Ligand binder design. Structure first.
Ligand SMILES: CCCCCCCCCCCCCCCCCC(=O)OC[C@H](COP(=O)([O-])OCC[N+](C)(C)C)OC(=O)CCCCCCCCCCCCCCCCC
Ligand SMILES: CCCCCCCCCCCCCCCCCC(=O)OC[C@H](COP(=O)([O-])OCC[N+](C)(C)C)OC(=O)CCCCCCCCCCCCCCCCC
Ligand SMILES: CCCCCCCCCCCCCCCCCC(=O)OC[C@H](COP(=O)(O)OCCN)OC(=O)CCCCCCCCCCCCCCCCC
Ligand SMILES: CCCCCCCCCCCCCCCCCC(=O)OC[C@H](COP(=O)(O)OCCN)OC(=O)CCCCCCCCCCCCCCCCC
Lengths: 459, 64, 99, 173, 26, 120, 55, 94, 57, 331, 63
């Protein structure tokens, strides 16, 4: 993985010494070649995970997420120099450095072999995101955002650390391959119940589960766009990925304690969706939609069914792409209006036809229009849940319904109407954002064409 | 902005845990909780007492 | 107001100076060059060439090997009359049953 | 052809020969002839061109052989080397069995389409075959969970063997 | 223009303790 | 763990015996990373003094990395010796106490009764 | 009612208020030497045999 | 651009607070009916009774004709609820 | 043309390519440390080619 | 292996071509409506022939041209079925379109974006084809929601019309409710029957598809504007008249009953589903016709007549009259 | 708007049409593979057991 790690690390000196004008160009292009190199990592052996070294390995679950992060890295670079144009060169270089360190930590996380190293980099993603959210944020509760986000993450992270070190003392090693091959049945002891809770609740905090999901409507809504997309697209996937890794040594106990959280998500995905309907801000609506989709992924994880795992992975990838695109579109409109209430600027479909389209298939993919990978990922989870329990369907059946409502509602109330007369700053569509939504959208349908890649390790 | 701040910021600072407020919280946030848990658990155990007793269809259910 | 503060700068649109602005930066030449580099690398060698790559990997999950061994053992077992698959994935004789 | 009647049974292709005794001649005839003349013949000759080009240089490839390795039942408790061998062997056996049931499903769907409305009458021969394939696939590989492994399959198999042994012992004195 | 702390934001913790009570007094 | 081991002589980095171990390679990734800390310390030193952090004081940065590598080598040799001592005391105690280290009559999974949990 | 009221009150705000309230009672000591040494005194026999740390 | 006074505050108690919230919401003391203080929020916000955006004048020169909304006029807590697209509060002949 | 300025401007670019080459070099110099089972797994345990004295590099 | 399969596929690829030309900008935007008219008429000419050799012999083949997924038991593949339903629906469908959008090219003559409108009729007809020529329930679902969001966009063609957007959203909500039963049916077939193509499902002889049949009934009720989920068609009437003459006229309102008669081999098993279809169809006929009795307009009146027609349509499917119903969809 | 879409199509087809002609050339000039048993001793290279010439080459280079 050092064919991807070493270039990512060496990307830091390039930006840190590039001229006052070349930082954006150089970072964008070289991150694009980094994504190209990581495109190779989609090469997967039939059943054996690709073990590059002792400390680094990859399989059909880590590789798609890694490719997602590496391909994403140019996208924040393209979305940031709009709101980062009027800044000192050193400050811009550090913003870029925060982004590269974030991507590097995500790569080491996804390619980590020992659970402790996975925890180290997984949590270590907090710091660059914290700096991005706090310093470069524009709204008020950004300072409150950082506190909420850090403390919510850590409150689950530390018990996970205690559980992992206890596992190391008892089992012998935290290596994934060992704990899977040398896996042993888990007894229904209450100490084992608390161990399962410690191993689960950190990822479920970052999932998020309903109830303890307040860090997203107070974090993604406030972060700069680059931070917002890197949060929603991948950082949410950290908990799902960790759960998929950890349920190997968390059975057969899970089912007995699967009952509270599963429905907590199942019911929660309704409320969040309902919360999406009666929203006032675009970014908050997208954040709550992300919460609902991630709750569906939670249900997929706790079913522990092959089909559930494949649908889960597909939903993570598709949701990352769709949420990043929706946040980018919201930023474009907000910057054009310097406000975020989704009533101030409506009826812009005529003014910006390409934005009107980009919003149209962004909503369609968010609404999971078949045969997009969003729809197949959702439907696989629906079928797995129905096999696990029939009634789930109606709740599932409710979700996209309400989702569809808001999935079109903002499009009705932001572009499908009459323009506001007193505003005039809406200029011609700068081709930067249009191109950015292109690099968002075309890979989505490309993966729709061949979903065997994002299908996960169960395929 | 007055509307947005009222429906986004003032809600908690102006919130007082009146008996009615706590009642509504109990009825909505945690009320249907036991309802859904009960119905789902009932289906799960009712079906479970159908597989291990053999009283269910399994002929072509090799995918789950 | 006890705080010497400059007035909030106006929201400066890129089109007023060079109409050909691509919304990247002030200077038209480097703005245009960033256009060329993105529209090259994002689409040409990553989106298009990368799509040829992902559409044309080598054997994935050995599914073709799975089929080309599958019909082989169907030929064998169906020809000799043996059931085309065994209810046990492991031979019961070599498995020592407890008690 | 590219598939044996042993691996993909095909009912014998029999077509009737109608006699258009009516003075009105059927139009679908003329459609077949024109379609053969200005579509089938050019695609065939272009195919001959590219097929002789293919036969000019035909590089070769073979099947990937897989030497058998000791099974998990023979594999010792917590011996990572033989455990890995048996796990990969069992994973590829699971893949081959998945393709077995896929082949049977394709064959029996083909049967249904050949027999048409009489599918119920003329597919039971392969219907029972797919039935037993799926029924034994359920007790061979299903219910193993997302983290299915050779050890879990062996455990399920063992549980089934104790169940059947106990049932046969108690039933038959 | 992102919110940069102003005078009233600065005074929220600039003195004695930032959790003032009657015990803080003066 | 080892501060009370017999034969230890206080206040000396490597107790002579450690030369029987393979010295850490000069290429060693731990060593070069400790050299990287030397480079970084130079960068803060120039930054802390309002200097051209990359080009200012090449000698100062060069001294920083050289000093870190030297103490890096001796620390690595000291680090490896203790871990070697840990293994030495381990296996020697293992052999000296056969009764407290039983051997296991190895048997295969075909005879282990591993219960199976139906995943429903 | 749920998100911005009950969900804030159930976990983040309650813990924040607890820490806020009782960090005040911890850190509002009058600073007098007499009471500090009196507390040291009380801790002496509390650790001595009141908890029976000796035995 | 907008200081504290426009930002909605706590529930008004004295009639002076009622008047203060009245000109905070660019409206007279009579039109200002503070939301019923019950711990649910709002407080200082003025209650616009029920009517949706379909009961306004379709011929008036509304500054926001999409929802027939006038500049700076106070808007309902459920304004998104009671909008032309969503549910209506207009009378029905039956 | 001022080619010295050309190199001073374009020497930002080389860092990631040389890092890629170094990374490839290193993870190539990460398998020779794990030759403990070359042609030793029973599945691939074949004979040693007369002209090719190893199974994999 | 004779031309049947080949030209039956050309009968959809040739009409897929115009959207590719429209997005490639090679098309002449001036006479592009004539371009779609001529493409559709040529499609109709290519479509009579499949009817021709279906009439001479009765040829009914199924093509698994491309294999998409293989989830270790479900070899998902892009497949099509040529049978009496699809084989004879294609020609009448393309003929109806070739008529009504030329009527549009006259009537629709003042909208500046006429090009996108004529594109839109095409996209609707494309999703209609892979809906009606479906071989697995996934293709049927793809068409099911493609026609859904396509009618969504077309109803709100005058997107400045707030009532048009409200009508489009109300139309969308109803078949979102409907497709819950669709998803339930696919889940049941994939779990209990382990099948997602029509062949394997009907072949499996699943004579107890109680919940699947209820789900299909709900999906058809949502798509065909049956009771409880009828009034979205009168709302959809807000769109252009040619939109009403292609989508809402008799094409996507019969998509639900098309799904019904496609699943008729399994429909006969559970008589309660027959009875429930009788209820839904009869009461829809009464209610919509009664509304049209006293209504004062031209468009919504024919809408209520339409919904009455769909009621009495799958009433006959209630008495297991599949081919009679599929003959009546043509009238 | 149109400059954006022109740039997209130009820079897509710029390398789209060379690969588009190339895959057809290697499909109809280079050829396709066929299956047989091992030639009793021939050791297969890692890219041997493959269908498409592009697949064989791409396995030959980075695999
Ligand atoms: C990088 C991250 C991790 C950093 C860890 C700490 C690194 C710096 C400290 C280690 C080097 C300096 C201390 C060790 C030294 O020189 O002598 C230790 C000591 C000094 O003698 P000593 O052991 O008699 O006295 C110190 C007593 N202890 C170890 C309990 C603190 O040991 C020796 O020099 C060797 C003989 C005794 C061995 C025990
Ligand atoms: C049709 C396909 C057209 C492809 C056109 C080129 C662009 C897409 C390919 C990008 C390759 C990225 C690098 C890669 O896959 O592996 C690194 C590759 C291979 O990495 P490697 O050198 O570590 O691979 C080990 C095996 N050997 C040494 C035999 C190659 O890098 C180089 O080849 C240098
Ligand atoms: C392989 C070695 C790579 C490094 C050494 C070679 C560098 C050049 C690579 C080929 C470039 C081909 C096109 C060259 C166009 C040059 C246009 C130009 O002169 O722009 C200069 C300008 C910056 O200002 P200045 O340099 O002062 O010149 C103007 C003075 N009035 O305006 C500008 O915008 C600067 C130039 C635009 C940026 C070009 C892109 C730089 C990186 C290109 C390669 C990326 C990939 C690298 C790896 C390839 C192999 C995998
Ligand atoms: C076998 C026969 C079965 C019984 C058939 C009964 C219906 C016969 C046909 C009635 C036609 C009525 C008609 O065309 O009415 C037109 C008229 C239109 O409106 P207008 O012109 O304004 O006149 C009304 C006052 N303004 O509107 C009217 O005048 C209103 C007439 C309303 C008639 C309602 C009939 C309902 C029949 C089904 C009842 C089911 C109950 C369960």
């Amino acid at each position: 993985m050092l064919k991807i790690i070493i270039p990512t690390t060496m990307l830091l000196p390039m930006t840190w010494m590039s001229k006052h004008n070349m930082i954006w160009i150089n970072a964008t292009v070289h991150s694009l070649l980094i994504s190209l190199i990581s495109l190779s990592l989609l090469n997967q052996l039939g059943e054996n995970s690709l073990n590059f070294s002792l400390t680094f390995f990859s399989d059909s679950l880590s590789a798609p997420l890694l490719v997602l992060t590496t391909w994403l890295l140019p996208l924040m670079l393209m979305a940031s120099q709009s709101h980062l144009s009027k800044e000192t060169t050193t400050r811009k270089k550090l913003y870029i450095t925060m982004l590269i360190l974030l991507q590097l930590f995500l790569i080491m996380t996804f390619t980590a072999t020992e659970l402790i190293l996975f925890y180290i980099l997984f949590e270590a993603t907090l710091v660059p995101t914290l700096i991005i959210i706090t310093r470069w944020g524009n709204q008020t509760e950004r300072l409150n955002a950082g506190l909420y986000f850090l403390f919510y993450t850590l409150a689950g992270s530390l018990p996970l650390l205690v559980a992992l070190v206890y596992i190391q003392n008892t089992t012998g090693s935290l290596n994934f391959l060992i704990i899977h091959y040398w896996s042993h049945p888990l007894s229904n002891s209450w100490s084992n119940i608390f161990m399962w809770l410690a191993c689960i609740m950190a990822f479920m905090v970052k999932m998020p589960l309903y109830g303890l999901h307040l860090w997203l409507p107070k974090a993604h809504v406030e972060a700069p766009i680059a931070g917002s997309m890197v949060l929603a697209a991948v950082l949410l996937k950290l908990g799902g990925y960790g759960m998929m890794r950890i349920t190997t040594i968390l059975n057969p106990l899970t089912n007995y304690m699967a009952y509270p959280f599963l429905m907590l998500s199942m019911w929660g995905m309704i409320m969040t969706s309902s919360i999406c309907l009666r929203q006032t801000d675009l970014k908050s609506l997208i954040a709550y939609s992300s919460v609902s989709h991630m709750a569906l992924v939670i249900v997929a994880i706790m079913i522990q069914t092959p089909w559930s795992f494949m649908g889960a992975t597909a939903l993570m990838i598709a949701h990352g792409l769709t949420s990043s695109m929706l946040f980018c579109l919201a930023n474009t409109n907000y910057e054009r209006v310097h406000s975020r209430t989704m009533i101030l600027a409506r009826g812009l479909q005529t003014l910006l036809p390409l934005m009107a389209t980009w919003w149209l298939m962004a909503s369609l993919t968010n609404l999971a229009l078949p045969p997009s990978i969003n729809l197949i990922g959702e439907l696989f989870i629906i079928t797995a849940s129905f096999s696990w329990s029939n009634i789930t369907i109606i709740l599932m059946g409710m979700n996209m319904m309400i989702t569809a409502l808001y999935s079109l509602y903002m499009l009705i109330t932001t572009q499908r109407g009459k323009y506001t007369h007193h505003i005039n700053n809406i200029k011609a569509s700068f081709t930067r954002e249009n191109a950015l939504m292109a690099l968002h959208i075309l890979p989505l349908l490309l993966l729709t064409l061949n979903p065997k890649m994002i299908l996960g390790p169960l395929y | 902005i007055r509307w947005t701040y009222a429906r986004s910021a003032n809600i908690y600072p102006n919130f007082r845990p009146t008996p009615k407020t706590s009642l509504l919280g109990a009825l909505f946030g945690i009320g249907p909780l036991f309802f859904w848990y009960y119905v789902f658990k009932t289906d799960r155990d009712k079906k479970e007492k159908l597989i291990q007793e053999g009283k269910l269809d399994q002929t072509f259910n090799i995918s789950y | 107001i006890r705080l010497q503060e400059d007035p909030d700068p106006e929201d400066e649109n890129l089109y007023e100076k060079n109409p050909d602005s691509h919304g990247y930066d002030k200077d038209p030449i480097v703005d245009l060059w960033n256009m060329r580099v993105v529209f090259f690398f994002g689409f040409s060698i990553v989106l298009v060439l990368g799509s040829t790559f992902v559409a044309y990997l080598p054997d994935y999950r050995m599914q073709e090997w799975a089929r080309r061994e599958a019909e082989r053992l169907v030929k064998y077992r169906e020809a000799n009359g043996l059931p085309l698959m065994e209810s046990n994935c492991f031979d019961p004789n070599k498995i020592q049953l407890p008690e | 052809d590219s598939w044996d009647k042993d691996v993909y049974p095909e009912p014998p292709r029999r077509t009737p020969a109608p006699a258009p005794q009516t003075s009105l001649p059927n139009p679908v005839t003329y459609l077949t002839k024109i379609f053969d003349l200005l579509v089938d013949r050019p695609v065939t000759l272009a195919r001959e061109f590219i097929e002789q080009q293919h036969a000019k240089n035909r590089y070769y490839y073979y099947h990937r052989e897989f030497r058998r390795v000791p099974d998990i039942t023979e594999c010792e408790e917590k011996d990572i080397l033989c455990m890995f061998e048996a796990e990969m062997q069992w994973r590829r056996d699971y893949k081959v069995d998945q393709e077995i049931v896929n082949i049977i499903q394709e064959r029996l769907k083909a049967c249904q389409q050949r027999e048409g409305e009489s599918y119920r009458q003329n597919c039971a021969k392969e219907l029972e075959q797919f039935t037993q394939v799926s029924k034994a696939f359920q007790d061979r590989y299903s219910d193993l969970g997302a983290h299915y492994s050779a050890r879990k399959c062996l455990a399920k198999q063992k549980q089934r063997m104790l169940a059947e042994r106990k049932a046969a012992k108690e039933a038959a004195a | 223009r992102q919110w940069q702390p102003d005078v009233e934001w600065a005074e929220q913790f600039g003195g004695a303790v930032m959790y003032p009570t009657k015990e803080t007094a003066h | 763990m080892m501060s009370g081991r017999p034969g230890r002589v206080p206040l000396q980095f490597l107790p002579n015996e450690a030369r029987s171990l393979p010295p850490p390679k000069l290429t060693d990734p731990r060593l070069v990373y400790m050299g990287f800390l030397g480079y970084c310390s130079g960068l803060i030193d120039n930054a802390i003094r309002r200097r051209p952090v990359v080009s200012a004081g090449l000698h100062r940065q060069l001294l920083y990395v050289t000093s870190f590598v030297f103490f890096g080598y001796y620390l690595l040799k000291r680090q490896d010796y203790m871990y070697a001592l840990r293994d030495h005391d381990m296996f020697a105690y293992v052999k000296s106490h056969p009764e407290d280290f039983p051997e296991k009559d190895k048997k295969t999974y075909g005879e282990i009764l591993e219960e199976f949990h139906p995943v429903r | 009612l749920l998100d911005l009221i009950w969900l804030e009150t159930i976990l983040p705000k309650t813990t924040s208020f607890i820490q806020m309230k009782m960090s005040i009672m911890v850190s509002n000591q009058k600073g007098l030497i007499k009471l500090y040494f009196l507390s040291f005194l009380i801790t002496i026999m509390i650790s001595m045999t009141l908890f029976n740390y000796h035995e | 651009h907008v200081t504290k006074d426009m930002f909605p505050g706590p529930y008004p108690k004295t009639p002076e607070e009622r008047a203060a919230a009245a000109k905070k919401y660019n409206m007279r003391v009579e039109d200002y009916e503070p939301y019923p203080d019950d711990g649910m929020g709002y407080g200082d916000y003025p209650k616009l009774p029920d009517r949706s955006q379909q009961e306004r004048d379709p011929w008036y020169d509304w500054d926001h004709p999409d929802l027939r909304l006038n500049w700076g006029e106070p808007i309902h807590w459920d304004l998104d609820m009671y909008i032309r697209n969503r549910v209506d509060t207009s009378p029905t002949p039956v | 043309m001022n080619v010295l300025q050309i190199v001073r401007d374009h020497w930002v670019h080389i860092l990631v390519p040389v890092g890629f080459v170094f990374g490839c070099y290193l993870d190539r110099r990460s398998d020779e440390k794990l030759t403990a089972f070359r042609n030793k797994s029973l599945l691939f345990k074949r004979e040693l080619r007369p002209n090719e004295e190893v199974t994999w590099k | 292996m004779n031309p049947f399969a080949s030209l039956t596929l050309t009968t959809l690829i040739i009409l897929t071509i115009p959207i590719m030309m429209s997005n490639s900008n090679i098309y002449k935007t001036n006479l592009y409506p004539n371009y779609v008219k001529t493409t559709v008429s040529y499609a109709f000419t290519l479509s009579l022939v499949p009817l021709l050799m279906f009439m001479h012999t009765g040829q009914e083949m199924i093509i698994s041209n491309w294999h998409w997924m293989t989830l270790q038991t479900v070899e998902l593949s892009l497949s099509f079925k040529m049978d009496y339903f699809s084989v004879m629906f294609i020609p009448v469908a393309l003929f109806v379109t070739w008529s009504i959008m030329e009527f549009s090219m006259w009537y629709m003559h003042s909208d500046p974006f006429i090009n996108r409108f004529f594109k839109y009729l095409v996209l609707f007809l494309i999703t209609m084809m892979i809906l009606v020529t479906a071989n697995n329930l996934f293709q049927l679902f793809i068409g099911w929601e493609g026609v859904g969001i396509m009618s969504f966009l077309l109803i709100g063609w005058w997107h400045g019309r707030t009532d048009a957007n409200t009508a489009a959203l109300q139309a969308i909500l109803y078949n979102r409710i409907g497709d819950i039963g669709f998803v339930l049916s696919m889940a049941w077939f994939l779990t209990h029957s382990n099948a997602w193509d029509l062949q394997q499902i009907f072949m499996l002889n699943n004579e107890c598809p109680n919940m699947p049949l209820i789900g299909l009934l709900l999906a058809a009720a949502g798509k065909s504007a049956q009771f409880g989920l009828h009034p979205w068609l009168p709302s959809a009437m807000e769109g252009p008249t040619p939109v009403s003459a292609l989508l809402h006229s008799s094409t996507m309102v019969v998509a639900g009953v098309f799904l019904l008669i496609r699943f008729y081999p399994l429909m006969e098993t559970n008589k309660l589903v027959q009875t429930m279809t009788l209820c839904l169809g009869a009461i829809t006929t009464l209610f919509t016709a009664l509304c049209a009795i006293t209504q004062n307009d031209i468009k919504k009146i024919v809408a209520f007549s339409t919904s009455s027609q769909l009621g009495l349509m799958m009433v006959t499917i209630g008495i297991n009259q599949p081919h009679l119903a599929f003959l009546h969809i043509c009238m | 708007d149109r400059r954006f879409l022109k740039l997209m199509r130009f820079y897509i087809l710029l390398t789209g049409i060379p690969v588009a002609i190339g895959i057809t050339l290697v499909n109809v000039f280079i050829g396709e593979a066929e299956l047989a048993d091992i030639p009793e001793g021939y050791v297969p290279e890692h890219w041997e057991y493959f269908k498409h010439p592009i697949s064989r080459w791409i396995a030959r280079t980075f695999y």
